[PDB]
Amino acid sequence: YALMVSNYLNWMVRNLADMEIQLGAVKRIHALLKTEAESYEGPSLIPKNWPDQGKIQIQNLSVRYDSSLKPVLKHVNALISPGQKIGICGRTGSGKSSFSLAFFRMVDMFEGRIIIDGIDIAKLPLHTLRSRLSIILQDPVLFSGTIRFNLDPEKKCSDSTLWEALEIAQLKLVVKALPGGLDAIITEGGENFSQGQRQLFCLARAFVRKTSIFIMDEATASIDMATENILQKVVMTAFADRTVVTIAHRVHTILSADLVMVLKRGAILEFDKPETLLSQKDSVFASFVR
Amino acid sequence: CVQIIGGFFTWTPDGIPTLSNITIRIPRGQLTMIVGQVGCGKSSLLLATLGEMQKVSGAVFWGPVAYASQKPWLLNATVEENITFESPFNKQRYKMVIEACSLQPDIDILPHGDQTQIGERGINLSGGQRQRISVARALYQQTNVVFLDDPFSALDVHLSDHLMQAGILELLRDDKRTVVLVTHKLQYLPHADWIIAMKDGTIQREGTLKDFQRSERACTKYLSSAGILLLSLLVFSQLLKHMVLVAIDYWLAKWTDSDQSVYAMVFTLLCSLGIVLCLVTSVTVEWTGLKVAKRLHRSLLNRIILAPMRFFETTPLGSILNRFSSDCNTIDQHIPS
Numbered sequence: 001y002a003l004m005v006s007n008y009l010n011w012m013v014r015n016l017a018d019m020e021i022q023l024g025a026v027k028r029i030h031a032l033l034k035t036e037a038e039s040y041e042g043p044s045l046i047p048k049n050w051p052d053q054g055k056i057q058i059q060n061l062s063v064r065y066d067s068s069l070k071p072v073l074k075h076v077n078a079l080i081s082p083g084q085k086i087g088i089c090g091r092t093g094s095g096k097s098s099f100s101l102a103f104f105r106m107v108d109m110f111e112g113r114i115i116i117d118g119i120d121i122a123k124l125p126l127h128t129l130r131s132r133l134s135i136i137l138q139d140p141v142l143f144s145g146t147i148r149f150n151l152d153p154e155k156k157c158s159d160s161t162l163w164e165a166l167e168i169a170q171l172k173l174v175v176k177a178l179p180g181g182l183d184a185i186i187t188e189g190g191e192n193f194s195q196g197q198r199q200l201f202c203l204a205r206a207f208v209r210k211t212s213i214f215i216m217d218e219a220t221a222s223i224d225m226a227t228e229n230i231l232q233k234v235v236m237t238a239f240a241d242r243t244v245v246t247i248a249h250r251v252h253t254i255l256s257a258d259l260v261m262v263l264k265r266g267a268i269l270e271f272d273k274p275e276t277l278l279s280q281k282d283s284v285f286a287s288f289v290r
Numbered sequence: 291c292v293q294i295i296g297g298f299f300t301w302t303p304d305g306i307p308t309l310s311n312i313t314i315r316i317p318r319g320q321l322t323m324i325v326g327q328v329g330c331g332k333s334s335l336l337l338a339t340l341g342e343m344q345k346v347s348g349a350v351f352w353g354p355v356a357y358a359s360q361k362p363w364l365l366n367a368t369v370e371e372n373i374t375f376e377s378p379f380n381k382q383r384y385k386m387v388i389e390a391c392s393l394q395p396d397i398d399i400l401p402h403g404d405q406t407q408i409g410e411r412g413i414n415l416s417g418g419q420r421q422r423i424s425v426a427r428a429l430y431q432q433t434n435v436v437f438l439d440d441p442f443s444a445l446d447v448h449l450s451d452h453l454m455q456a457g458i459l460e461l462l463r464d465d466k467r468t469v470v471l472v473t474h475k476l477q478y479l480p481h482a483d484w485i486i487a488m489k490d491g492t493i494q495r496e497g498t499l500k501d502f503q504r505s506e507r508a509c510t511k512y513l514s515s516a517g518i519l520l521l522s523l524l525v526f527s528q529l530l531k532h533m534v535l536v537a538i539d540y541w542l543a544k545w546t547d548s549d550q551s552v553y554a555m556v557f558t559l560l561c562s563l564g565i566v567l568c569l570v571t572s573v574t575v576e577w578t579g580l581k582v583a584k585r586l587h588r589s590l591l592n593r594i595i596l597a598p599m600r601f602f603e604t605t606p607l608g609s610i611l612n613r614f615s616s617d618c619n620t621i622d623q624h625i626p627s
C-alpha cells in the first residue's frame with residue numbers, strides 16, 4: 001500500500017486540480033444561466049382573430065433603451081387611419097429605428113399607451129404581438145441553408161407562392177440564373193448576394209408573411225434609385241389593403257405618402273396634405289430638402 | 291493612372307465569368323463615379339483593380355492603397371487606433387479627419403469621451419457610426435488611390451452632404467489624390483470627372499460627363515441535475531467496492547503467512563464481489579455524466595432564448611459562443627473520465 005500510494009498521491013493531486021478547473025468551467029456556465037431577467041411572455045384577445053383594420057394610435061409615448069438613462073422619445077402622440085400608407089422622416093439620432101423597435105416592445109423602458117383597434121398589450125402575451133406585424137430592417141441578415149429556408153423557415157408554402165413573391169419583389173431573374181433555383185445553397189452573407197439582394201430577400205420575407213401592418217426601416221439603404229422607384233410603386237400596388245409605415249432617407253418615397261410625420265430632436269409632428277405640408281413649415285423641413 | 295485593358299475573370303478555377311471585356315483609364319487627381327444596377331460588378335471591379343482577384347486574361351497596372359469596403363469592420367482596439375491604423379498620430383491631421391467625418395459629437399456622447407474599447411465587430415456602435423469610422427480610417431491614411439465602396443448607405447441626406455463636401459471635395463481633392471467612389475446619389479455626379487456605367491458585368495458607356503451626354507450557487511444545481519439518487523448510488527458503490535478490495539487483501543495477508551477450504555471459499559466469493567461492485571460503479575458514473583450534459587445544454591439554450599435584446603447587445607458575443615463551445619465540450623468529454 002505504501003508503494004501504491006507513493007504514486008497515487010501525485011496522480012490524485014493532478015486529478016483534483018483537473019476537477020477544480022472543470023468545476024470553475026461549470027460555475028461560469030451556472031453564472032451565465034440566471035441572468036437575462038425573465039422578460040417572458042405572459043386569453044381573451046387571442047381567441048379572436050387579429051383585426052385587419054390597421055387603425056393604430058400611440059398616446060404620450062416615451063422610450064429608454066437602458067433603465068435610468070437618457071430618454072430617446074418624449075411626448076410622442078400619433079394616430080393612423082386604417083389601410084393608409086404612413087411616412088416618417090428625420091435626421092440621424094432622431095428616433096425612427098427607436099420608434100420601430102418600440103412598436104414591437106423591444107425597448108423595456110417605454111411609457112405611454114399603444115392602442116391597435118381598441119386592443120393593446122393589456123391582455124396579450126408577446127407571441128401574438130410578434131405575429132401581428134411585419135418588419136424590414138436596415139441591417140440585412142441571411143443565415144445559411146437554401147433559399148426556401150431563408151424565405152420561409154416554417155416550410156409552409158408552395159413553390160408557385162414563392163415564385164410569385166420573388167417576381168413581385170423584382171428578384172426572379174437573378175434567382176432563375178442560379179443552379180438549383182429554389183435550392184441554391186446560401187452561405188451567411190458572402191458574395192452569393194450583394195447588399196441590395198439581401199435587402200430584396202428581406203422584402204420577400206415581408207411579402208410572404210402576409211400580415212396587416214408593415215414597418216420598413218430604410219428599404220432604400222442599398223438599392224439603386226432607378227430600381228427603387230419602380231420597386232416602391234410595385235410594393236404599393238401589391239400591399240394596397242394594409243397599413244405600411246416607412247422610414248427612408250429617399251425624398252421621393254416620403255413625397256408619395258399621404259400622412260407624413262417628421263421626427264424632431266425628441267418629438268414628432270404630423271402633416272397630411274402635400275400642398276399644405278410644404279408651405280406651412282415656411283418651406284424649411286420638407287420643401288427645400290426636396 | 292490606373293489602367294485596365296481586356297478585363298476578364300470569374301470566381302473559381304473554372305466557370306462562367308462575370309468580368310468580361312473591361313477597359314478603363316483612371317488619371318490621377320480625378321474623381322470617378324462608378325454607377326449601375328444591383329449586381330453589376332461594381333465592388334467586383336473594385337476588388338479586381340485591387341489585385342485581390344487576378345484576372346484570367348487581361349492587363350491591369352497602377353502600391354499600398356487605402357480602401358473602405360462595402361461591409362465595414364472594426365478592430366479590437368480603441369477608436370483612435372481604428373482611425374490611425376499603425377500610423378503615427380498627428381495633431382491637426384487626426385482632428386481634421388474627425389471633424390470632416392461628422393463623428394466628433396457622437397464620439398463625445400460615448401461613455402468614454404475617446405479610446406472607448408469598441409466591442410467585437412462594433413456591437414456597442416450604431417449602423418452609421420461604423421461606416422463613418424471605416425471611412426475615417428480610409429481617409430486618414432496617406433496613399434495615392436482611395437476606393438470607397440458605397441460609403442453613403444447608412445447615412446442620411448445631411449450627413450452625406452457634409453461628408454461629401456468636406457472630406458471628398460475639400461480634404462481629398464486638396465492633396466490631389468486619386469478617388470474611386472462607387473455609390474448612387476444626385477449630388478455627386480456634377481462633381482466627378484469620369485462616369486462608368488455597369489450592366490450585367492459589362493461597361494455600357496464610358497468617359498467624362500460631356501462625352502457621355504453626347505453619346506447614344508454553482509455546484510448545488512449541478513449535483514441536483516445529476517440526481518440525488520444517482521450520485522448517492524455512485525458514492526455508495528465506490529466506497530463498497532474499495533472496502534471489498536482492502537478487505538480481501540488484508541484477509542489474504544493474514545492467510546498467506548500461515549479452515550483452508552473456508553478461506554478458499556471466502557477468496558472466491560470476494561473475487562466476484564469485487565468485479566460486480568466495480569462494474570456497477572463504472573456504469574453509474576457514465577450515466578451521471580450523460581444526464582448532467584444534456585440537462586445543462588437544454589437549460590442553457592432556453593435561458594438564452596428568453597433573453598431581452600438589451601442583454602444580447604450588451605454582452606460580448608464572442609464570450610457567449612466560446613463559453614458555450616468550450617464548456618459544453620469539457621463537460622461532455624473531460625468531466626466523466
Ligand SMILES: Nc1ncnc2c1ncn2[C@@H]1O[C@H](COP(=O)(O)OP(=O)(O)O)[C@@H](O)[C@H]1O
Pocket residue numbers: 065066072091092093094095096097098099416603
Ligand atoms: N441599443 C442602444 N443602446 C443605447 N442607446 C441607443 C441604442 N440604440 C440607439 N440608441 C440611442 O438612441 C438615440 C437615437 O436612436 P436611434 O433609433 O438610433 O435613431 P436613428 O434610427 O435615427 O439612428 C441615439 O442617441 C443613440 O445613442
Ligand SMILES: Nc1ncnc2c1ncn2[C@@H]1O[C@H](COP(=O)(O)OP(=O)(O)O)[C@@H](O)[C@H]1O
Pocket residue numbers: 191192193194195196301308327328329330331332333334335
Ligand atoms: N465571391 C463571389 N461569388 C459568387 N458570386 C459573386 C462573388 N462576388 C460577386 N459575385 C456576383 O457578381 C455580382 C457583383 O455585384 P456587386 O458589384 O457587388 O453589386 P453592388 O456593387 O451593386 O453591391 C453579384 O451579382 C454577385 O452575384
Ligand SMILES: [Mg+2]
Pocket residue numbers: 096097138417
Ligand atoms: Mg436607424
Ligand SMILES: [Mg+2]
Pocket residue numbers: 194195332333360440
Ligand atoms: Mg456593392
